[PDB]
């Protein structure tokens, strides 16, 4: 039949030592046992989880070694095998559960009502213990610090990868380092199922220890022993115990993959209060038990002796507001002074020059006023900045760098992927094969910045969305029978490449690029950065570039790089602020606009300028004054603010020659 083998481990002495450790253990550094305190805390319907530390277990072993009596190296037994010690510890907790000391508080708990109703009828006229349980038991991996303190080495907490997980580590407690890619919704998994039986005896309980089960549907009680055909069992959800279950996939980091290989993936299962600890896009260190999946059902026959695997998770270690602190940070930055120039300069300190562009990127980072006028009129406060110019002028570092500053931002590129206009209504998700409404990148960045690199090569299909956002900021959705309009208020940062190379003495700016005049008119600001050879500038550029290669540090200079978290804190605080205008300030704007138009009537010339001024220019003047006012000022806007905005616009306009 089944042969027998002798193994050193005996579970009786282990159980005795667990019972001794629960009572005796004290924190050496409230007084008394460490865990009977938290058990009493649990009994008062406040704590939902019990977490054991193997450092503490080593402390009990060290205490016993100080006494000198032999031990059973419980820490090694837990590491080698952990699926059984969970049940052992659960039984040990159940045996020594303290009484409720205060605030019994039975209000509307359905399971409580069922259990209380059971008592009267059972006594007047044995169930699975897990039904009465509420706490969840988790283990905590070892610490190298405590290990090195008492040697003994450590295996459970070592940050292995997905690839270093061999088949020799199955059934042990290990830790894996990786990035979370997919997380699923929370669903209930049955643990104890209760069937109601046509007022025959009473409801019956069955435990489920697999992913698949069979209903009972036959009443075996003493009163139900009567021979007449009477009916099968019906399930009752209220008297049954469920649990929260979640499954995730972790993927190997790019640094740890060897050359020529493709990264692998691992599956993680989490049950209990630990659910929702992991989200997509997080680099974490997850500890758990590595167990074999049954792989049954279809396609099991072909494998024969091949199994799946998964990791039952028990611990999570993620690697990486209005308060007086941030109230004082802004005051400190105000007392620092030179906020405008320093804020513009610290943006991408590697790149030397293009300081006006850095001023304009700051105004794009902040947003103008979005005022909802009555009778349906709306006015946009978002910023549309396009940066044109010859190749090899740092076109595509500037952009990427701006994406770092604001959390709400997406870097979308040419026809390699379609994300600008992918407001599709069909999503063939493999998990369920049903449609999901999937928004595009333009919709994704709300109150944010959309960085569209290589805008020249992008197709007219995305041009439709770009045209519509600047008009109404509300994306109409695909024609898959939903008729949905989605909010898409966003600011646009575009990078352009002139047609066939560099700037051309062809006079029309429309000839330099493919973009239509109407599309360019909606842009708030246009910047031309042409590469003109000058003997002085090349020397400083070469020196600046080569200093970075010689020493990895950027070239030290009197200019001080402000700390980036301060950048974010000031930018957010400015964004929260709401300006206001006065009647006197806007009167000078009319004079400015009429002077600009009287210039534009004669400004039509062979080479310089793009068409003529439009009322959209007046709108953008106020829109840009918004950000310059939000930068440091409040309440009414200064008159010199309009001068600053006009100066920035005029420099951008004069960039056509330069």
């Amino acid at each position: 039949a089944l042969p027998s083998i002798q193994l050193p481990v005996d579970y009786n002495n282990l159980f005795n030592e667990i019972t001794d450790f629960l009572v005796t253990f004290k924190q050496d550094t409230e007084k008394g046992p460490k865990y009977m305190a938290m058990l009493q805390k649990v009994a008062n319907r406040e704590l939902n989880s019990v977490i054991i530390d193997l450092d503490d277990i080593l402390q009990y072993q060290n205490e016993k070694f100080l006494q000198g009596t032999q031990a059973d190296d419980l820490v090694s037994a837990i590491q080698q095998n952990a699926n059984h010690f969970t049940e052992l510890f659960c039984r040990a907790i159940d045996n020594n559960m303290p009484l409720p000391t205060k605030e019994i508080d039975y209000k509307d708990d359905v399971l409580d009502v069922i259990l209380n109703q059971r008592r009267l009828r059972n006594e007047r006229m044995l169930f699975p213990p897990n039904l009465t349980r509420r706490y969840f038991l988790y283990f905590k991996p070892l610490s190298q610090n405590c290990a090195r303190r008492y040697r003994k080495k450590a295996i459970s907490s070592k940050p292995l990868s997905v690839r270093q997980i061999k088949g020799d580590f199955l059934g042990q407690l290990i830790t894996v380092r990786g990035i979370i890619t997919r997380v699923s919704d929370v669903k209930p998994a049955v643990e104890v199922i209760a069937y109601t039986c046509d007022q025959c005896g009473y409801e019956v309980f069955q435990e489920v220890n697999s992913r698949t089960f069979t209903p009972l549907s036959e009443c075996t009680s003493e009163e139900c022993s009567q021979n007449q055909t009477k009916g099968q069992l019906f399930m009752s959800t209220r008297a049954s115990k469920f649990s929260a279950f979640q499954e995730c996939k972790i993927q190997e980091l790019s640094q740890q993959v060897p050359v020529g290989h493709i990264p692998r993936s691992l599956n993680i299962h989490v049950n209990g209060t630990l659910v929702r600890s992991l989200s997509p896009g997080d680099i974490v260190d997850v500890t758990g038990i590595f167990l074999p999946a049954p792989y049954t059902g279809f396609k099991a026959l072909k494998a024969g002796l091949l199994t799946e695997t998964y990791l039952e998770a028990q611990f999570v270690r993620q690697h990486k507001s209005l308060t007086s602190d941030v109230e004082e940070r802004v005051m400190e930055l105000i007392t620092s002074g030179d906020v405008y120039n320093r804020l513009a300069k610290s943006i991408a300190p590697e790149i030397y020059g293009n300081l006006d562009v850095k001023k304009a990127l700051l105004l794009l980072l902040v947003g103008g006023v979005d005022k909802r006028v009555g009778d349906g009129m709306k006015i946009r406060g978002d910023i549309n900045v396009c940066l044109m110019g010859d190749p090899g002028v740092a076109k595509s570092q500037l952009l990427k760098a701006i994406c770092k500053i604001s959390p709400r931002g997406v870097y979308t590129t040419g026809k390699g992927s379609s994300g600008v206009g992918l407001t599709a209504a069909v999503m063939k998700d493999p998990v369920t094969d049903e449609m999901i409404l999937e928004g595009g990148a333009l919709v994704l960045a709300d109150n944010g910045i959309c960085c569209i690199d290589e805008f020249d090569k992008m197709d007219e299909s995305d041009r439709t969305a770009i045209h519509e956002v600047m008009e109404q900021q509300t994306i109409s959705i695909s024609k898959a029978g939903i008729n949905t309009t989605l909010n898409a208020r966003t600011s646009i940062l575009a990078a352009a490449n002139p047609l066939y190379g560099r700037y051309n003495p062809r006079l029309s700016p429309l000839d330099n690029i493919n973009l239509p005049a109407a599309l360019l008119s909606r842009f708030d600001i246009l910047f031309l950065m042409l590469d003109i050879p000058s003997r002085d500038d090349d020397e400083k550029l070469a020196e600046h570039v080569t200093y970075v290669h010689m020493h990895n540090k950027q070239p030290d200079l009197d200019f001080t790089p402000v700390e980036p978290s301060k950048m974010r804190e000031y930018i957010a605080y400015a964004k929260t602020k709401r300006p206001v205008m006065s009647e006197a300030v806007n009167d000078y704007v009319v004079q400015a606009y009429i002077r600009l138009r009287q210039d534009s009537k004669r400004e039509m010339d062979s080479k310089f300028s793009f068409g003529q001024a439009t009322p959209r220019t007046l709108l953008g003047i106020i829109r840009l004054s918004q950000a310059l006012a939000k930068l440091r000022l409040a309440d009414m806007v200064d008159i010199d603010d309009v001068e600053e905005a006009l100066r920035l616009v005029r420099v951008s306009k004069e960039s056509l020659y330069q």
Partner: protein, 495 residues
Amino acid sequence: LRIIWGTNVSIQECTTNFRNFLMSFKYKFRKILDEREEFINNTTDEELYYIKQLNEMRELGTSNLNLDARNLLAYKQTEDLYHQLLNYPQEVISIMDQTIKDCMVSLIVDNNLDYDLDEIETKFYKVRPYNVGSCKGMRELNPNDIDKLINLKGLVLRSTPVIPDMKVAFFKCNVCDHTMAVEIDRGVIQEPARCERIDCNEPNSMSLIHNRCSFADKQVIKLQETPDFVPDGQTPHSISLCVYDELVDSCRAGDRIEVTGTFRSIPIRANSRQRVLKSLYKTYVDVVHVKKVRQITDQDLAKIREVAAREDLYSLLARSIAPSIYELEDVKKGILLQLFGGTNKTFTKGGRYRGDINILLCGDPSTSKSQILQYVHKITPRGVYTSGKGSSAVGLTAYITRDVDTKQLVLESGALVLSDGGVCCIDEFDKMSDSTRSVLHEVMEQQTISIAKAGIITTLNARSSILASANPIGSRYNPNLPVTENIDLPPPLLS
């Protein structure tokens, strides 16, 4: 005294508390409850809000209630039901309907009138509670609140046709032809063993008559999590909703609704043939109340007449349609005249004569024509605002397309057919393709569109009005050159 098994709810006290609540409650107790200051007590304290709705429902005969949770908590003694309903919705609602059964009698015989009450006896009543508790999204739902009333919010994606549900089986005997009806409980049909007729009494002589049973209606709805609450780098989640009886065919596709209902979870089978089930349930909600996000009265007629008696009706609605637009009064005059349209006639001999006005706006590129079109879009009852930049060549007319959910054929009308009897606004008229332009030609000439594809040959009705806006080539419309060169439009289409 006796309590329904499992729960702690007893009918005896609940019925009495509810009748006390209904005959006792007023806005007085409600405004004492909320007491948020600046609370009006101007004769509202004695209005008897529940009794007046009860009487108006009795005289109308409709059965719809809007019982609220805060109002239910307002009364001190009935405060128990507030926490007794969240945990046991079904039994409390069963008591609800049973008490409303005699709520009619409690008021019909106060003056001993001659109401029949027999049609009241036959008809049944129910309730639609709302605002049960704090609204929480589907992203936060644990197994800890199964079979408890919740309030959810989400986007409607799709609906399914009516689903039959058996209520009363019907078995006939193939020998003696005897008919008997067997009720079904929770889906399972208890088969008749042998014919009840003692004389017939034959084993295995039963036949099911499918079309002689009794059925009820079901509908299933699909929801999606709203984009506002979703965090970064996530995919929206979905929930299925069960709708029964009068609430079927209420939620249109693409709307955003807040619903109240009972959370539930059921098992689904592992193997289709075997009895075996798998240890992971599916979660859904059974809904009880749904909320979203003609027949003009005589007073409206009188005010319409007196306003129509204004000295200058032309200029007033000239300025009303586009409040933001300054000057450009003449184009507003034309649009106001267009929105009414001349009379339409179709006499037998000559045929139909058109009664729609078509308007084309064009000129320098940075005027405000698009805002004008979006203004006239809203005023008109039925109309469509779609640009002519691209899309399918028959995107404004019928386009036979394969159905996505089912591998079937669906005939989908376009934007010109969907603007029948109204004003259809076209934007960016100059970018419309040479092949689709001809379609508009048959629309503006015969007002009908014919489709002949996939074995389908048919004609639809356009009968709409075209308001279009265009842009020239260049940054200005120089008056010296005539219209034709600048607008890039065929002479007949402009004509």
